[PDB]
Amino acid sequence: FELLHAPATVCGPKKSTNLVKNKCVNFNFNGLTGTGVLTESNKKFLPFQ
């Protein structure tokens, strides 16, 4: 094991559960975390957003 400056390119496996909609949920998106209701929407995002 070697760790000098940038330990952000060799990590362990990452899990991904199922998704649900229209119900309160405590979510964790790419590190962004909160509580809400995840309902599909219409807003348009540019491919890097």
Binding site: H5, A6, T9
Partner: protein, 33 residues
């Protein structure tokens, strides 16, 4: 030209080196800014 346009990311690299110079590698067989 005196217009407007935005710029989008392409390539993020975790290379993380200590840079204090810059150069260009151009062919040799109307310029840049």
């Amino acid at each position: 030209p005196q217009g407007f346009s935005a710029l989008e990311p392409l390539v993020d690299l975790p290379i993380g080196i200590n840079i204090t110079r810059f150069q260009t590698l151009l062919a040799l067989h109307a310029a840049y800014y």
